[PDB]
Protein backbone atom coordinates (compact mmCIF):
# COMPACT_ATOMS: atom_id res chain seq x y z
CA UNK A 1 0.00 0.00 0.00
CA UNK A 2 2.03 2.92 -1.41
CA UNK A 3 0.30 6.32 -1.63
CA UNK A 4 1.13 9.62 -3.31
CA UNK A 5 -0.85 12.75 -2.47
CA UNK A 6 -2.25 14.66 -5.41
CA UNK A 7 -2.35 18.46 -5.68
CA UNK A 8 -4.83 20.44 -3.56
CA UNK A 9 -5.93 17.20 -1.90
CA UNK A 10 -6.05 17.71 1.90
CA UNK A 11 -3.65 15.69 4.11
CA UNK A 12 -6.71 14.06 5.61
CA UNK A 13 -8.20 12.65 2.39
CA UNK A 14 -4.83 11.20 1.40
CA UNK A 15 -4.58 9.64 4.85
CA UNK A 16 -8.06 8.11 4.68
CA UNK A 17 -6.98 6.67 1.35
CA UNK A 18 -3.85 5.26 2.94
CA UNK A 19 -5.74 3.65 5.79
CA UNK A 20 -8.16 2.07 3.35
CA UNK A 21 -5.27 0.85 1.18
CA UNK A 22 -4.02 -1.07 4.24
CA UNK A 23 -7.55 -2.20 5.12
CA UNK A 24 -7.59 -3.44 1.50
CA UNK A 25 -4.08 -4.89 1.73
CA UNK A 26 -4.58 -6.74 5.04
CA UNK A 27 -1.42 -5.53 6.80
CA UNK A 28 -2.52 -5.52 10.43
CA UNK A 29 -4.51 -8.74 10.00
CA UNK A 30 -1.35 -10.24 8.48
CA UNK A 31 0.86 -9.02 11.34
CA UNK A 32 -1.64 -10.33 13.86
CA UNK A 33 -1.63 -13.71 12.16
CA UNK A 34 2.17 -14.08 12.51
CA UNK A 35 2.87 -12.62 15.96
CA UNK A 36 2.64 -16.20 17.33
CA UNK A 37 3.19 -19.77 16.19
CA UNK A 38 0.08 -21.65 15.05
CA UNK A 39 0.22 -25.47 14.86
CA UNK A 40 -0.70 -26.98 11.44
CA UNK A 41 -3.51 -28.96 13.06
CA UNK A 42 -4.81 -25.65 14.48
CA UNK A 43 -4.89 -23.77 11.15
CA UNK A 44 -6.56 -26.75 9.49
CA UNK A 45 -9.06 -26.52 12.38
CA UNK A 46 -9.56 -22.79 11.73
CA UNK A 47 -10.02 -23.49 7.99
CA UNK A 48 -12.84 -26.03 8.39
CA UNK A 49 -14.62 -23.84 10.95
CA UNK A 50 -14.78 -20.81 8.61
CA UNK A 51 -15.84 -22.99 5.66
CA UNK A 52 -18.70 -24.12 7.93
CA UNK A 53 -19.69 -20.57 9.07
CA UNK A 54 -19.62 -19.57 5.39
CA UNK A 55 -22.93 -21.37 4.96
CA UNK A 56 -25.95 -19.09 5.59
CA UNK B 1 -63.87 -29.89 -16.91
CA UNK B 2 -61.97 -30.23 -20.20
CA UNK B 3 -58.32 -30.73 -21.09
CA UNK B 4 -58.68 -27.71 -23.41
CA UNK B 5 -60.64 -25.94 -20.71
CA UNK B 6 -57.94 -26.51 -18.05
CA UNK B 7 -54.94 -25.65 -20.21
CA UNK B 8 -56.09 -22.06 -20.64
CA UNK B 9 -56.15 -21.36 -16.88
CA UNK B 10 -52.59 -22.65 -16.61
CA UNK B 11 -53.53 -25.65 -14.47
CA UNK B 12 -50.66 -27.33 -16.33
CA UNK B 13 -48.05 -24.95 -14.89
CA UNK B 14 -46.18 -26.35 -11.91
CA UNK B 15 -43.24 -25.42 -9.71
CA UNK B 16 -39.61 -25.53 -10.69
CA UNK B 17 -37.69 -28.79 -11.15
CA UNK B 18 -35.61 -28.00 -8.05
CA UNK B 19 -38.61 -28.06 -5.71
CA UNK B 20 -40.36 -31.22 -6.85
CA UNK B 21 -41.29 -34.16 -4.66
CA UNK B 22 -40.32 -37.33 -6.50
CA UNK B 23 -43.59 -39.14 -5.61
CA UNK B 24 -45.24 -37.01 -8.27
CA UNK B 25 -43.29 -38.51 -11.17
CA UNK B 26 -46.35 -40.20 -12.73
CA UNK B 27 -48.33 -36.97 -13.12
CA UNK B 28 -45.62 -34.82 -14.71
CA UNK B 29 -45.68 -34.50 -18.51
CA UNK B 30 -42.11 -33.30 -18.45
CA UNK B 31 -40.46 -29.95 -17.89
CA UNK B 32 -39.63 -26.83 -19.85
CA UNK B 33 -37.75 -23.71 -18.68
CA UNK B 34 -36.61 -25.44 -15.45
CA UNK B 35 -40.30 -25.70 -14.53
CA UNK B 36 -42.28 -28.92 -14.19
CA UNK B 37 -45.22 -29.40 -16.52
CA UNK B 38 -48.01 -31.55 -15.17
CA UNK B 39 -49.88 -34.07 -17.34
CA UNK B 40 -53.38 -32.93 -18.22
CA UNK B 41 -54.04 -36.38 -19.62
CA UNK B 42 -53.74 -37.54 -16.02
CA UNK B 43 -55.42 -34.52 -14.41
CA UNK B 44 -58.90 -34.50 -15.91
CA UNK B 45 -60.01 -38.11 -15.42
CA UNK B 46 -58.67 -37.95 -11.86
CA UNK B 47 -60.41 -34.58 -11.32
CA UNK B 48 -63.70 -35.75 -12.79
CA UNK B 49 -63.43 -38.80 -10.55
CA UNK B 50 -62.99 -36.40 -7.63
CA UNK B 51 -66.16 -34.53 -8.57
CA UNK B 52 -68.17 -37.76 -8.82
CA UNK B 53 -67.40 -38.89 -5.30
CA UNK B 54 -68.12 -35.35 -4.11
CA UNK B 55 -71.39 -35.43 -6.00
CA UNK B 56 -72.23 -38.74 -4.32
CA UNK B 57 -71.27 -37.44 -0.85
CA UNK B 58 -73.29 -34.25 -1.34
CA UNK B 59 -76.35 -36.28 -2.39
CA UNK B 60 -76.52 -38.00 1.02
CA UNK B 61 -76.58 -34.60 2.75
CA UNK B 62 -72.79 -34.73 3.15
CA UNK B 63 -70.97 -31.75 4.60
CA UNK B 64 -68.02 -30.43 2.59
CA UNK B 65 -65.18 -28.45 4.11
CA UNK B 66 -63.36 -26.25 1.60
CA UNK B 67 -59.82 -25.51 2.82
CA UNK B 68 -57.52 -22.94 1.22
CA UNK B 69 -55.79 -20.29 3.31
CA UNK B 70 -53.50 -18.71 0.74
CA UNK B 71 -53.91 -14.94 1.06
CA UNK B 72 -54.23 -14.57 -2.70
CA UNK B 73 -57.16 -17.01 -2.97
CA UNK B 74 -58.76 -16.67 0.50
CA UNK B 75 -61.80 -14.78 -0.81
CA UNK B 76 -62.34 -17.00 -3.87
CA UNK B 77 -62.54 -20.08 -1.63
CA UNK B 78 -65.22 -18.41 0.47
CA UNK B 79 -67.53 -17.38 -2.40
CA UNK B 80 -66.87 -20.79 -3.95
CA UNK B 81 -67.83 -22.41 -0.65
CA UNK B 82 -70.91 -20.31 0.10
CA UNK B 83 -72.28 -20.73 -3.45
CA UNK B 84 -73.01 -24.40 -2.59
CA UNK B 85 -74.31 -24.12 1.02
CA UNK B 86 -71.17 -25.58 2.65
CA UNK B 87 -68.34 -24.62 4.98
CA UNK B 88 -64.81 -23.25 4.69
CA UNK B 89 -61.50 -22.41 6.34
CA UNK B 90 -59.97 -19.44 4.56
CA UNK B 91 -57.42 -18.07 7.02
CA UNK B 92 -54.75 -19.76 9.18
CA UNK B 93 -55.99 -23.19 10.09
CA UNK B 94 -56.12 -23.66 13.86
CA UNK B 95 -54.45 -26.97 14.66
CA UNK B 96 -57.02 -29.32 16.16
CA UNK B 97 -60.17 -27.92 14.51
CA UNK B 98 -61.14 -31.49 13.76
CA UNK B 99 -59.08 -33.62 16.15
CA UNK B 100 -59.83 -31.28 19.09
CA UNK B 101 -63.22 -30.20 17.73
CA UNK B 102 -64.88 -30.45 21.14
CA UNK B 103 -62.64 -27.64 22.43
CA UNK B 104 -62.68 -25.58 19.24
CA UNK B 105 -66.45 -25.97 19.20
CA UNK B 106 -66.54 -23.74 22.31
CA UNK B 107 -65.01 -20.92 20.28
CA UNK B 108 -67.86 -21.31 17.80
CA UNK B 109 -70.38 -20.81 20.59
CA UNK B 110 -68.36 -17.75 21.56
CA UNK B 111 -68.61 -16.45 18.00
CA UNK B 112 -72.37 -16.70 17.84
CA UNK B 113 -72.89 -15.23 21.31
CA UNK B 114 -70.80 -12.27 20.09
CA UNK B 115 -72.46 -11.43 16.75
CA UNK B 116 -75.91 -12.26 18.17
CA UNK B 117 -75.31 -10.01 21.21
CA UNK B 118 -73.82 -7.27 19.04
CA UNK B 119 -76.95 -7.26 16.91
CA UNK B 120 -80.14 -8.63 18.50
CA UNK B 121 -78.73 -8.10 22.02
CA UNK B 122 -77.24 -5.06 20.24
CA UNK B 123 -75.58 -3.42 23.30
CA UNK B 124 -73.98 -0.33 21.51
CA UNK B 125 -73.93 0.91 25.08
CA UNK B 126 -70.38 -0.17 25.79
CA UNK B 127 -67.70 1.69 27.82
CA UNK B 128 -66.24 2.85 24.45
CA UNK B 129 -63.43 0.29 24.47
CA UNK B 130 -65.71 -2.73 24.29
CA UNK B 131 -67.10 -1.57 20.93
CA UNK B 132 -63.70 -2.22 19.37
CA UNK B 133 -62.41 -4.68 22.03
CA UNK B 134 -65.40 -7.02 21.57
CA UNK B 135 -65.36 -6.35 17.80
CA UNK B 136 -61.64 -7.15 18.01
CA UNK B 137 -62.48 -10.60 19.33
CA UNK B 138 -65.43 -10.98 16.93
CA UNK B 139 -63.30 -9.75 14.02
CA UNK B 140 -60.66 -12.38 14.78
CA UNK B 141 -63.11 -15.26 15.33
CA UNK B 142 -64.83 -14.44 12.05
CA UNK B 143 -61.75 -15.03 9.88
CA UNK B 144 -60.77 -18.05 11.90
CA UNK B 145 -64.19 -19.69 12.21
CA UNK B 146 -66.59 -17.79 9.94
CA UNK B 147 -66.72 -20.66 7.45
CA UNK B 148 -67.41 -23.58 9.84
CA UNK B 149 -69.49 -21.60 12.30
CA UNK B 150 -72.62 -23.60 11.35
CA UNK B 151 -70.90 -26.90 10.50
CA UNK B 152 -72.38 -28.49 13.63
CA UNK B 153 -70.34 -31.69 13.39
CA UNK B 154 -67.31 -33.26 11.72
CA UNK B 155 -67.29 -32.84 7.94
CA UNK B 156 -67.80 -35.83 5.61
CA UNK B 157 -65.11 -34.66 3.19
CA UNK B 158 -62.36 -32.07 2.79
CA UNK B 159 -61.52 -30.19 -0.39
CA UNK B 160 -58.08 -28.64 -0.14
CA UNK B 161 -56.13 -25.99 -2.08
CA UNK B 162 -52.43 -26.96 -1.80
CA UNK B 163 -51.64 -30.17 0.09
CA UNK B 164 -48.30 -28.93 1.42
CA UNK B 165 -49.61 -25.57 2.63
CA UNK B 166 -52.53 -27.33 4.30
CA UNK B 167 -50.66 -30.43 5.47
CA UNK B 168 -52.08 -29.92 8.97
CA UNK B 169 -55.74 -30.13 7.95
CA UNK B 170 -55.10 -33.10 5.67
CA UNK B 171 -53.38 -34.88 8.58
CA UNK B 172 -56.29 -34.38 10.94
CA UNK B 173 -58.66 -35.72 8.29
CA UNK B 174 -56.43 -38.76 7.78
CA UNK B 175 -56.66 -39.53 11.49
CA UNK B 176 -60.47 -39.21 11.49
CA UNK B 177 -60.97 -41.24 8.31
CA UNK B 178 -62.36 -38.19 6.55
CA UNK B 179 -61.62 -38.40 2.80
CA UNK B 180 -59.39 -35.70 1.34
CA UNK B 181 -59.75 -34.22 -2.13
CA UNK B 182 -56.86 -31.92 -2.90
CA UNK B 183 -55.16 -29.88 -5.55
CA UNK B 184 -51.67 -31.37 -5.24
CA UNK B 185 -48.93 -29.39 -6.99
CA UNK B 186 -45.65 -30.92 -8.26
CA UNK B 187 -43.77 -29.94 -5.06
CA UNK B 188 -46.21 -31.60 -2.66
CA UNK B 189 -46.71 -35.01 -1.06
CA UNK B 190 -49.71 -36.90 -2.48
CA UNK B 191 -49.66 -39.64 0.17
CA UNK B 192 -52.19 -37.98 2.48
CA UNK B 193 -54.73 -37.56 -0.34
CA UNK B 194 -57.39 -40.17 -1.18
CA UNK B 195 -58.25 -38.48 -4.45
CA UNK B 196 -55.25 -36.64 -5.81
CA UNK B 197 -55.90 -33.79 -8.23
CA UNK B 198 -52.54 -32.77 -9.68
CA UNK B 199 -52.30 -29.21 -10.96
CA UNK B 200 -51.19 -25.66 -10.11
CA UNK B 201 -52.38 -24.65 -6.63
CA UNK B 202 -51.35 -20.97 -6.65
CA UNK B 203 -52.59 -19.01 -9.68
CA UNK B 204 -55.98 -17.44 -8.93
CA UNK B 205 -57.18 -18.32 -12.46
CA UNK B 206 -56.31 -21.98 -11.95
CA UNK B 207 -57.57 -22.07 -8.37
CA UNK B 208 -60.94 -20.59 -9.31
CA UNK B 209 -61.36 -23.18 -12.07
CA UNK B 210 -61.22 -26.24 -9.83
CA UNK B 211 -63.13 -24.41 -7.10
CA UNK B 212 -65.70 -23.02 -9.51
CA UNK B 213 -66.09 -26.57 -10.77
CA UNK B 214 -66.24 -28.00 -7.24
CA UNK B 215 -68.97 -25.67 -5.99
CA UNK B 216 -71.02 -26.25 -9.12
CA UNK B 217 -71.03 -30.08 -8.80
CA UNK B 218 -72.10 -29.81 -5.16
CA UNK B 219 -75.26 -28.00 -6.26
CA UNK B 220 -75.91 -30.63 -8.93
CA UNK B 221 -75.38 -33.29 -6.27
CA UNK B 222 -77.64 -31.21 -4.00
CA UNK B 223 -80.39 -30.44 -6.54
CA UNK B 224 -80.97 -34.19 -7.14
CA UNK C 1 12.26 -36.08 -28.65
CA UNK C 2 11.39 -33.84 -25.71
CA UNK C 3 10.57 -30.16 -26.33
CA UNK C 4 11.95 -27.36 -24.13
CA UNK C 5 11.45 -23.62 -23.73
CA UNK C 6 14.74 -22.06 -22.60
CA UNK C 7 15.33 -18.55 -21.32
CA UNK C 8 18.65 -17.20 -20.15
CA UNK C 9 19.55 -13.66 -19.23
CA UNK C 10 23.10 -12.42 -19.56
CA UNK C 11 25.06 -9.80 -17.62
CA UNK C 12 24.80 -6.64 -19.78
CA UNK C 13 28.56 -6.18 -19.61
CA UNK C 14 28.91 -9.43 -21.63
CA UNK C 15 26.20 -8.77 -24.21
CA UNK C 16 28.81 -9.16 -26.97
CA UNK C 17 29.39 -12.83 -26.16
CA UNK C 18 25.69 -13.51 -26.66
CA UNK C 19 25.99 -14.06 -30.39
CA UNK C 20 28.65 -16.70 -29.72
CA UNK C 21 26.69 -18.45 -26.98
CA UNK C 22 23.79 -18.89 -29.39
CA UNK C 23 25.89 -20.31 -32.22
CA UNK C 24 27.38 -22.81 -29.76
CA UNK C 25 24.16 -23.96 -28.10
CA UNK C 26 22.52 -24.46 -31.47
CA UNK C 27 25.46 -26.55 -32.66
CA UNK C 28 25.14 -28.94 -29.74
CA UNK C 29 21.44 -29.43 -30.47
CA UNK C 30 21.80 -29.81 -34.21
CA UNK C 31 24.85 -31.95 -33.45
CA UNK C 32 22.82 -34.33 -31.26
CA UNK C 33 20.39 -34.32 -34.24
CA UNK C 34 17.86 -32.18 -32.36
CA UNK C 35 15.89 -29.35 -33.96
CA UNK C 36 15.71 -25.66 -33.10
CA UNK C 37 12.20 -24.22 -33.45
CA UNK C 38 12.18 -20.62 -32.22
CA UNK C 39 14.91 -18.23 -31.20
CA UNK C 40 14.38 -14.67 -29.99
CA UNK C 41 17.23 -12.34 -29.09
CA UNK C 42 15.37 -9.91 -26.83
CA UNK C 43 18.45 -7.79 -26.27
CA UNK C 44 18.70 -5.55 -23.24
CA UNK C 45 15.54 -5.25 -21.21
CA UNK C 46 14.68 -3.51 -17.92
CA UNK C 47 14.42 -5.76 -14.85
CA UNK C 48 11.36 -5.91 -12.63
CA UNK C 49 13.58 -5.91 -9.55
CA UNK C 50 17.34 -5.66 -9.11
CA UNK C 51 19.45 -8.83 -9.37
CA UNK C 52 23.14 -8.73 -8.49
CA UNK C 53 22.68 -4.96 -8.14
CA UNK C 54 21.79 -4.82 -11.85
CA UNK C 55 18.98 -2.98 -13.50
CA UNK C 56 18.59 -4.25 -17.07
CA UNK C 57 20.08 -7.46 -18.53
CA UNK C 58 20.35 -9.04 -21.99
CA UNK C 59 17.60 -11.63 -22.55
CA UNK C 60 17.55 -14.57 -24.97
CA UNK C 61 14.68 -16.94 -25.77
CA UNK C 62 14.90 -20.43 -27.20
CA UNK C 63 12.40 -23.15 -28.04
CA UNK C 64 14.15 -26.39 -28.86
CA UNK C 65 13.73 -30.09 -29.57
CA UNK C 66 16.62 -32.07 -28.05
CA UNK C 67 17.79 -35.06 -25.95
CA UNK C 68 18.50 -35.20 -22.23
CA UNK C 69 22.27 -35.27 -22.74
CA UNK C 70 22.51 -31.96 -24.60
CA UNK C 71 19.87 -30.46 -22.32
CA UNK C 72 21.96 -31.65 -19.36
CA UNK C 73 25.06 -29.97 -20.80
CA UNK C 74 23.11 -26.77 -21.20
CA UNK C 75 21.81 -26.59 -17.64
CA UNK C 76 25.29 -27.02 -16.17
CA UNK C 77 27.13 -24.69 -18.58
CA UNK C 78 24.58 -22.03 -17.48
CA UNK C 79 25.78 -22.51 -13.89
CA UNK C 80 29.43 -22.60 -14.95
CA UNK C 81 29.13 -19.43 -17.07
CA UNK C 82 29.26 -16.34 -14.82
CA UNK C 83 27.84 -14.17 -17.60
CA UNK C 84 24.49 -15.92 -17.16
CA UNK C 85 22.95 -14.36 -14.05
CA UNK C 86 19.66 -16.27 -14.42
CA UNK C 87 18.34 -19.03 -16.68
CA UNK C 88 15.43 -21.44 -16.90
CA UNK C 89 14.66 -24.49 -19.00
CA UNK C 90 11.02 -25.58 -18.97
CA UNK C 91 9.56 -28.60 -20.70
CA UNK C 92 6.80 -28.02 -23.30
CA UNK C 93 4.42 -30.63 -24.71
CA UNK C 94 4.95 -29.46 -28.29
CA UNK C 95 6.98 -27.17 -30.47
CA UNK C 96 6.16 -23.50 -30.71
CA UNK C 97 6.68 -21.27 -33.71
CA UNK C 98 4.84 -18.02 -33.24
CA UNK C 99 6.29 -14.71 -32.14
CA UNK C 100 6.40 -14.40 -28.41
CA UNK C 101 4.41 -11.53 -26.88
CA UNK C 102 7.81 -9.76 -26.67
CA UNK C 103 8.28 -9.57 -30.44
CA UNK C 104 4.68 -8.31 -30.74
CA UNK C 105 4.92 -5.91 -27.75
CA UNK C 106 7.52 -3.75 -29.56
Amino acid sequence: PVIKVRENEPFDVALRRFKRSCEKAGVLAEVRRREFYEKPTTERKRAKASAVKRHA
Amino acid sequence: VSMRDMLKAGVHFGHQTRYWNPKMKPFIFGARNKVHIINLEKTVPMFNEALAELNKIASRKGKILFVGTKRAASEAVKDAALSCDQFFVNHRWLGGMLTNWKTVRQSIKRLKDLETQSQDGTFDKLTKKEALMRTRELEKLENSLGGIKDMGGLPDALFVIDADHEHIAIKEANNLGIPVFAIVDTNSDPDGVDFVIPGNDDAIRAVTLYLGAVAATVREGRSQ
Amino acid sequence: MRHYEIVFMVHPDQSEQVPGMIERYTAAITGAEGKIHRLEDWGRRQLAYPINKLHKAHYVLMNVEAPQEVIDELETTFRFNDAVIRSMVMRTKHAVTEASPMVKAK
Binding site: P1, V2, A25 | - | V7, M9, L47, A48, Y49, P50, I51, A57, L61, R86, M88, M90, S100, P101, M102, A105
Partner: protein
Protein backbone atom coordinates in the same frame (compact mmCIF):
# COMPACT_ATOMS: atom_id res chain seq x y z
CA UNK D 1 -2.89 -20.72 -23.94
CA UNK D 2 -1.54 -18.94 -20.86
CA UNK D 3 2.12 -18.04 -21.01
CA UNK D 4 4.31 -16.39 -18.37
CA UNK D 5 5.71 -14.19 -21.20
CA UNK D 6 2.40 -12.40 -21.72
CA UNK D 7 3.02 -9.95 -18.86
CA UNK D 8 0.22 -7.74 -20.22
CA UNK D 9 -2.43 -10.33 -19.36
CA UNK D 10 -0.66 -11.42 -16.19
CA UNK D 11 -0.85 -7.88 -14.79
CA UNK D 12 -4.65 -7.96 -14.66
CA UNK D 13 -4.37 -10.70 -12.03
CA UNK D 14 -1.90 -9.20 -9.51
CA UNK D 15 -2.33 -6.42 -6.95
CA UNK D 16 -0.54 -3.08 -6.68
CA UNK D 17 2.11 -4.93 -4.67
CA UNK D 18 2.50 -7.80 -7.12
CA UNK D 19 0.46 -10.23 -5.00
CA UNK D 20 -1.63 -12.81 -6.86
CA UNK D 21 -5.35 -11.96 -6.85
CA UNK D 22 -7.52 -14.87 -5.60
CA UNK D 23 -10.05 -16.61 -7.86
CA UNK D 24 -12.85 -15.11 -5.79
CA UNK D 25 -12.20 -11.48 -6.81
CA UNK D 26 -11.31 -12.24 -10.44
CA UNK D 27 -13.95 -14.90 -10.97
CA UNK D 28 -11.53 -16.98 -12.99
CA UNK D 29 -12.10 -20.76 -13.42
CA UNK D 30 -10.24 -22.96 -10.91
CA UNK D 31 -8.18 -24.87 -13.45
CA UNK D 32 -6.75 -21.73 -14.93
CA UNK D 33 -6.23 -19.97 -11.56
CA UNK D 34 -3.52 -22.55 -11.06
CA UNK D 35 -2.21 -22.09 -14.62
CA UNK D 36 -2.01 -18.32 -13.99
CA UNK D 37 -0.24 -18.57 -10.68
CA UNK D 38 2.36 -20.88 -12.26
CA UNK D 39 2.93 -18.36 -15.04
CA UNK D 40 3.07 -15.45 -12.60
CA UNK D 41 5.55 -17.44 -10.52
CA UNK D 42 7.57 -18.23 -13.63
CA UNK D 43 7.45 -14.60 -14.68
CA UNK D 44 8.63 -13.51 -11.25
CA UNK D 45 11.73 -15.70 -11.30
CA UNK D 46 12.62 -14.24 -14.71
CA UNK D 47 12.15 -10.73 -13.37
CA UNK D 48 9.38 -10.02 -15.89
CA UNK D 49 7.26 -9.25 -12.83
CA UNK D 50 8.09 -7.95 -9.36
CA UNK D 51 7.65 -10.15 -6.29
CA UNK D 52 6.88 -7.10 -4.17
CA UNK D 53 6.16 -3.38 -4.43
CA UNK D 54 9.37 -2.85 -2.44
CA UNK D 55 11.72 -3.26 -5.42
Amino acid sequence: EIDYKDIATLKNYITESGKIVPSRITGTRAKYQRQLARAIKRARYLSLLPYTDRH
